[PDB]
Design a protein around this ligand. Structure first.
Ligand SMILES: Nc1ncnc2c1nc(Br)n2[C@@H]1O[C@H](CO)[C@@H](O)[C@H]1O
Ligand SMILES: [Mg+2]
Length: 390
């Protein structure tokens, strides 16, 4: 009669990391890639012989900086002349060129110089998320919901859809990241009456706060605020500067000019930063860091909290601005939702909870997975084709 339908997937197409989920048997499964990772770097690398996507691209970035593309989401649907684009280009080791006032990334690939639109790079990331899902399901996937930031305009939303079409996906819907995070907690299934939800999204490079109103499952974005210069990478930089100074004191050597030693230090710092979210201290153990000197040291959670204290406190300014813009008081917020791996930082949680006079925070769904979780829930709802009974 009628063949069973393939499951639809939910993709969080992130600036730095992407995540894929599927809703089956009344629950969401976040799908790990072939290296066992639940999130995949939004990186595409080009060589003379291969195109690498995800973890394989990110793991060779150090020796191939000019031909490894990341941050395509900061370029999607924007004009080359845009002041956001011009400022960002100074931080990127890859070439961004102007083609009819549209940015394109230019790389060496398979013996030739090739330029790609940002939607073409994003389609390569979406192709990898589709293959991750098909490896788990064991059949081809066609249907997907893809999420975007709430501040994305029509051009940025259309370019995201275009990336989906290039990847061979049927895009069911483009949904806002804060809406997907609310759906993950079922905040649209609480019945009649207005609820005010604050989403606190602290990423690798940016911070976004959104205030949504939910009435009978209908979402309205009331206010958005944030800091484009605040994220996980800034906390990593604070530890890097700290250990560079520590090496100077202990061995009387300045390492800041050996890129390999700095990179090994930064890699070790990001891991120590993660350990400090569950432990009160963390060890740093690098062999032959500089001039055959081994760097074996430690950092307490209290010292790390001191090093990033101004940065953590600055997350409350966009919160107060969003609340003023929404014309609401903090007591009027019904639910608080955490999004992004950097929200696992206990001090970040403590500051926000204290700001909302001890209120519980929704953090039960892994914050780096909540957006894809909500997108998978929506995708399963959008493919239902039930016919009314008599
Ligand atoms: N447990 C964690 N504690 C502290 N930080 C974390 C954690 N997990 C993740 Br993931 N991060 C950081 O989140 C950002 C995601 O783009 C990166 O800067 C990661 O370092
Ligand atoms: Mg995100």
């Amino acid at each position: 009669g009628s063949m069973a339908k393939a499951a639809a997937i939910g993709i969080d197409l992130g600036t730095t990391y992407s995540c894929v989920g599927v809703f089956q048997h009344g629950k969401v499964e976040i799908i790990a890639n072939d290296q066992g990772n639940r999130t995949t770097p939004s990186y595409v690398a080009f060589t003379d012989t291969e195109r690498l996507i995800g973890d394989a691209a990110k793991n060779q970035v150090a020796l191939n900086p000019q031909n490894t593309v990341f941050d395509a989401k900061r370029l999607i649907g924007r004009k080359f002349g845009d002041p956001v684009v011009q400022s960002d280009m100074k931080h990127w080791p890859f070439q961004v060129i102007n083609d009819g006032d549209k940015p394109k990334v230019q790389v060496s690939y398979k013996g030739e110089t090739k330029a790609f639109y940002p939607e073409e790079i994003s389609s390569m990331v979406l192709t990898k998320m589709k293959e991750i899902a098909e490896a788990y399901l064991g059949y081809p996937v066609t249907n997907a919901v893809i999420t975007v930031p709430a501040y994305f305009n029509d051009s940025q939303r259309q370019a995201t859809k275009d990336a989906g079409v290039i990847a061979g996906l049927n895009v069911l819907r483009i949904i806002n990241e804060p809406t997907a995070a609310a759906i993950a907690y079922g905040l649209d299934r609480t019945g009649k009456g207005e609820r005010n939800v604050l989403i606190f999204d602290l990423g690798g490079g940016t911070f976004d706060v959104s205030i949504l109103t939910i009435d009978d499952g209908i979402f309205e974005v009331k206010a958005t605020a944030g800091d484009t210069h605040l994220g996980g990478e800034d906390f990593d930089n604070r530890l890097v500067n700290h250990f560079v100074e520590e090496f100077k004191r202990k061995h009387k050597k300045d390492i800041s000019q050996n890129k390999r030693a700095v990179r090994r230090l930064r890699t070790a710092c990001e891991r120590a930063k993660r350990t400090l979210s569950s432990s009160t201290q963390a060890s740093l153990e690098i062999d032959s860091l500089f001039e055959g000197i081994d760097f074996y040291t430690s950092i307490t959670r209290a010292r790390f909290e001191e090093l990033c204290s101004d940065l953590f406190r600055s997350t409350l300014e966009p919160v107060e601005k969003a609340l003023r813009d929404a014309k609401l008081d903090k007591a009027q917020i019904h639910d608080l939702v955490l999004v992004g791996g950097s929200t696992r930082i206990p001090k970040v949680q403590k500051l926000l909870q204290d700001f909302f006079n001890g209120r519980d925070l929704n953090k039960s769904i892994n914050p780096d997975e909540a957006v894809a979780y909500g997108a998978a829930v929506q995708a399963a709802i959008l493919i239902k084709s039930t016919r009314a009974a008599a």
